[PDB]
């Protein structure tokens, strides 16, 4: 069943560039919907920043 198995077809990571994140998605809470940034179960701890993406925020874990 769920947890550690979640498939997010349509959400490739920004940290490592992996296709459609597996296990749990990490939806950026403060970065805008136009960007809609994402991290893997490991990458969500990486605390990354771009031109828009910053460490000023938090991420949301998605178990489904």
């Amino acid at each position: 069943g769920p947890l550690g198995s979640v498939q997010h077809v349509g959400f490739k990571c920004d940290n490592c560039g992996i296709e459609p994140i597996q296990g749990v998605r990490w939806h950026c809470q403060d970065c805008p919907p136009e960007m809609s940034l994402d991290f893997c179960d490991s990458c969500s701890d990486c605390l990354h920043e771009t031109d828009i993406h910053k460490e000023d925020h938090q991420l949301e874990p998605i178990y489904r």
Binding site: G10, F11, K12, S36, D38
Partner: peptide, 8 residues
């Protein structure tokens, strides 16, 4: 990154 496709 939202690669998620949708209708026009």
């Amino acid at each position: 990154a939202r690669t998620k496709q949708t209708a026009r």
